[PDB]
């Protein structure tokens, strides 16, 4: 004795650009909310330790939003002019905000009304200010003065190192997670320089030429970096000191790139890159920085950020548009007498000598077509398949499986005109597909050879067949032209 085999769903040959689980994850990212801001937002940074929060720069204001709530948690507004940078520490408590006065204001999170350190950069406005990750108490800032400055909290009134050797408009600098001493820096000449802090510093260790202005430096791998500037972006390997790959897959000059690794995803490493159209594109270094996904927000995107790997909850992808917008997409994640008379249902048998069971799981709920096809009432199976609210692929499965199990004649014996109508309505809705033209041809020819003279007795089906003849002629026109192009395609071969 066996069980009943479940009804087997029809699967077409695969259509081009099929869904990978990586794209399944990028579409599992749902729930895109839009938040208005005063001017073009500049920099978004998540909290490293507990990633339930992230700060966004704004007009003379930094706004820390939550993740599980996506609401304004904190508003720093003690500034004079627009904040330039906002970066968290490696310990999730102290954030720095580069301003437009030439000073980076560094204070603790979760407390807006105090000022812990006012580190004065060069008089020219400090563009990018970042904490270290391996070290916990050192900062690096870059101004319009074309000099970068390494600062300590203890010496806040004089810089720890003054890193020089630049040309024009240093707008990015970053560090490498393997070496806490070698730093990378990009100005508006491309030409990412790589310096050492333990050494002198004014002269780098080595340069890597990016001709168009590099705008972001990204240490993805312990051996690789990203030149994110101009229309393209070049991913280099610094241990080989040469560009491993390059991607010019973008329309406008790029403005943002971030990286995420070792998190709940089928793609281990993901690289987001926003290029000033709403267009953020996801590549992956595992597949040599090849295109994996892309979103488009209408406003020109300025920033983008991902929730880190330790987000331990709802995963977030935020894009800041230069119209003053924040577009966040989130993949979301009886009495005592009665219990004393039935309190035995919670034992589960962890101690007893012999354990025996023969239970079966409650299976997936069979649908109406499945129950009627298993109960062999085949005409009503056809009706409950041809209800209006049921899909083309599902009724294709019903039609194919019923034509396989029984015959169309026994499926079509005792039909009248009010039940003849939805069959041919669905046929006129679906003759224009490749997937089901032969099967609808079989069924409509069988119903025709069965109901010749009821068709001549009924006039309301006559107008539906004349409607069929004008639509059955496009495969005589357009699909006939599909074969003609197939003929003149072999000419070029």
């Amino acid at each position: 004795s066996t069980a009943r085999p479940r009804i087997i769903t029809s699967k077409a040959p695969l259509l081009p650009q099929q869904t990978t689980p990586e794209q399944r994850y990028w579409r599992q990212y749902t729930s895109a909310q839009l938040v208005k801001e005063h001017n073009s937002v500049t920099h978004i940074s998540f909290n490293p330790q507990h990633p339930h929060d992230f700060a966004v720069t704004s007009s003379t204001r930094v706004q820390i939003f939550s993740s599980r709530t996506r609401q304004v948690i904190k508003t720093f507004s003690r500034f004079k002019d627009v904040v330039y940078s906002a970066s968290f520490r490696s310990d999730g408590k102290l954030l720095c905000a580069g301003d437009a006065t030439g000073l980076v204001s560094v204070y603790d999170s979760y407390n807006p009304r105090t000022i812990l350190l006012s580190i004065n950069a060069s008089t020219h406005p400090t563009h990018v200010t970042k904490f270290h990750t391996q070290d916990n108490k050192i900062l690096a800032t870059a101004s319009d003065d074309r000099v970068t400055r390494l600062w300590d909290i203890s010496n806040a009134y004089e810089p720890q190192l003054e890193l020089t050797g630049a040309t024009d408009y240093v707008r990015t600098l970053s560090f490498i997670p393997a070496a806490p001493h070698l730093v990378a820096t990009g100005s508006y000449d491309g030409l990412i320089r790589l310096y050492d802090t333990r050494s002198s510093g004014s002269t780098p260790i080595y340069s890597l030429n990016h001709d168009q202005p590099v705008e972001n430096v990204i240490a993805v791998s312990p051996t690789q970096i990203v030149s994110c500037g101009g229309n393209n972006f070049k991913v280099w390997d610094l241990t080989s000191n040469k560009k491993l790959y390059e991607r010019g897959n973008f329309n406008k000059a790029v403005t943002c790139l971030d990286y995420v690794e070792n998190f709940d995803s089928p793609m281990q490493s993901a690289l987001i890159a926003s290029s000033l159209d709403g267009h953020v594109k996801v590549f992956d270094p595992l597949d040599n920085f090849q295109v994996k996904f892309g979103w488009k927000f209408s406003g020109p995107v300025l920033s983008c950020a991902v929730s880190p790997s330790t987000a331990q909850g709802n995963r977030h992808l935020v894009a800041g548009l230069s119209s003053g917008l924040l577009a966040i997409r989130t993949k979301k994640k009886k009495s005592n007498n009665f219990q004393r008379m039935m309190r035995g249902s919670e034992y589960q048998g962890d101690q007893e000598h012999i354990i025996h069971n023969d239970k079966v799981r409650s299976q997936r709920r069979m649908r109406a077509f499945e129950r009627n096809i298993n109960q062999f009432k085949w005409s009503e199976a056809l009706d409950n398949a041809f209800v209006p609210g049921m899909a083309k692929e599902l009724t294709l499965t019903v039609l194919q499986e019923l034509r396989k199990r029984g015959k169309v004649r026994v499926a079509l014996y005792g039909r009248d005109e009010s039940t003849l109508e939805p069959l041919l309505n669905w046929c006129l809705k679906g003759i224009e597909d490749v997937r089901s033209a032969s099967i609808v041809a079989d069924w409509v020819a069988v119903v025709l050879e069965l109901y010749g003279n009821t068709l001549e007795s009924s006039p309301v089906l006559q107008e539906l067949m004349i409607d069929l003849k004008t639509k059955v002629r496009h495969e005589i026109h357009k699909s006939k032209e599909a074969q003609r192009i197939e003929g003149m395609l072999q000419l070029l071969t």
Partner: protein, 317 residues
């Protein structure tokens, strides 16, 4: 859990401890056949639609009666069954039958060796209780009688030797809502037999019901009066009578209540005297919800709400 213990006076140990999953154990009953005397089945059911049969050493053999060959619509639960013998009376062969309650009056009778739906009898109203009486006709033939009882007080006596027919009825005097009917004095489910020649008739019939009342009749006059008078009307309990159990030789009837604690009473028969020197105020009983007797040794096991089965022995046997 089905816990099989070997029983002594000093060391009461585990022979087996089986556990079923998703299967509550509200009723469980041993069985050794009258034809085979070595089979040793265990029938077990709870608030579900399947009755387990465990046969009698590391791999346990557990069959499950889950389909009903006539109709599965009568009972939405298997939570109460009784086991009995049945001789075919055309062929001189005794096999095992099980009786199951349904909705209103349907008692289903199953051949237990194969889960066969043998018979079914419908008493009206709401089915409350039923029991098996044995009647030896001659040397080598006996017939079983289903003594079922409703709530209002009607007592139906069917015979199942042939196809299930109603021999007689009689009303219990009193018993507005009846919980337990129990016939004793001979071979019953609590005092099983080893051969057909050991089968005798019962003598007394007790009925224990929600007002604490146990009406005790004698069968020798009930069978000829057909509207009988109780030999005794015991009322020493004030709560629901939940356990009526006779002795294996017909001398003590115990009535026990699962509603209140320390709720066990012993009555000596035919003197119909409720005992005084036991149970005392210092008698550990708890909510008495299960009682059981020894076949020959004169022992009493009392299982309660806490999960304890305390053990006594009467010194005369």
């Amino acid at each position: 859990t089905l816990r099989i213990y070997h029983i002594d006076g000093k060391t009461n140990h585990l022979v087996t401890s089986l556990h079923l999953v998703g299967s509550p154990i509200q009723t469980c009953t041993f069985y050794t056949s009258l034809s085979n005397q070595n089979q040793q089945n265990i029938f077990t059911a709870g608030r579900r639609r399947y009755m387990h049969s465990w046969d009698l050493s590391q791999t346990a053999k557990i069959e499950k009666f889950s389909r009903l060959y006539g109709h599965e619509s009568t009972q939405r639960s298997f939570e109460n069954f009784k086991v009995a013998h049945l001789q075919n009376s055309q062929t001189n062969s005794v096999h095992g039958i099980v009786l199951l309650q349904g909705n209103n009056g349907w008692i289903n009778i199953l051949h237990s060796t194969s889960g066969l739906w043998l018979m079914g009898c419908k008493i009206e109203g709401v089915i409350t209780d039923f029991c098996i009486d044995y009647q030896p006709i001659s040397r080598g033939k006996f017939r079983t009688i289903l003594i079922a009882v409703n709530a209002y007080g009607e007592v139906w006596e069917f015979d199942l030797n042939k196809n299930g027919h109603v021999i007689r009825r009689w009303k219990d005097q009193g018993g507005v809502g009846i919980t337990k009917i129990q016939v004793g004095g001979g071979t019953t489910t609590t005092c099983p037999a080893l051969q057909i020649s050991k089968i005798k008739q019962n003598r007394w019939l007790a009925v224990g019901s929600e007002s604490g009342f146990v009406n005790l009749y004698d069968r020798n006059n009930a069978m000829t009066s057909s509207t009988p008078t109780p030999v005794a009307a015991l009322d020493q309990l004030t709560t629901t009578i939940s356990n009526l159990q006779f002795s294996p030789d017909g001398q003590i009837l115990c009535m026990a209540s699962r509603a209140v604690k320390d709720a066990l009473r012993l009555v000596h028969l035919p003197s119909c005297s409720v005992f005084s020197n036991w149970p005392t105020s210092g008698t550990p009983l708890g909510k008495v919800t299960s009682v059981a007797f020894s076949p020959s040794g004169g022992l009493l096991a009392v299982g309660n709400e806490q999960g304890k089965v305390r053990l006594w022995k009467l010194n005369h046997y």
